[PDB]
């Protein structure tokens, strides 16, 4: 909890409070669709409709299963979707804080656009476009 804020170096505690509700939106939606008889094609199709969005959202990086919706959906999966967290992974940066300061004084170019927002969210598929200056 507190150290998760410390490890991810989040600007605000309410930002953690946002994504728990955003996880809470998915989680009760994960509940109510699961509270159906197994013979329903409405049930079987629409679980897959929800999953196939969340792959390209980058929350489900690997290919996942039905029960992993209760499991793999965390706030930290959303916390990894932040811009400098993605920036540290592909190893053009050097530390966590180095990824911060380059967004601060503006050395990161995602595709054709200049971005200096620290709360920028990165998907699974748009990540090939981060360029230098």
């Amino acid at each position: 909890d507190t150290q998760v804020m410390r490890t991810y170096h989040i600007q605000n505690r309410e930002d953690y409070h946002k994504y728990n509700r955003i996880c809470g939106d998915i989680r009760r939606l994960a509940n109510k669709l699961s509270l159906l008889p197994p013979t329903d094609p409405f049930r079987r199709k629409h679980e897959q409709l929800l999953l196939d969005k969340l792959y390209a959202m980058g929350v489900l990086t690997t290919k996942s299963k039905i029960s992993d919706l209760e499991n793999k959906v965390t706030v930290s999966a959303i916390c990894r979707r932040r811009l400098p967290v993605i920036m540290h992974r592909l190893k053009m940066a050097e530390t966590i804080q180095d990824a911060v300061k380059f967004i601060e004084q503006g050395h990161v170019r995602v595709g054709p656009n200049l971005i200096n927002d620290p709360a920028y969210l990165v998907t699974r598929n748009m990540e090939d476009y981060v360029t230098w200056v």
Binding site: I22, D25, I26, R28, L29, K32, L33, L36, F42, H46, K53, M57, A119, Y120, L121, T123
Partner: peptide
């Protein structure tokens, strides 16, 4: 009943579709 539960989830579904698409432009 079963038709009623379809209306309950889909309204929650469409807003949840709407909220994640906001974050896709973020």
């Amino acid at each position: 009943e079963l038709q009623k539960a379809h209306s309950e989830i889909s309204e929650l579904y469409a807003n949840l579709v709407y909220k994640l698409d906001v974050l896709s432009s973020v």
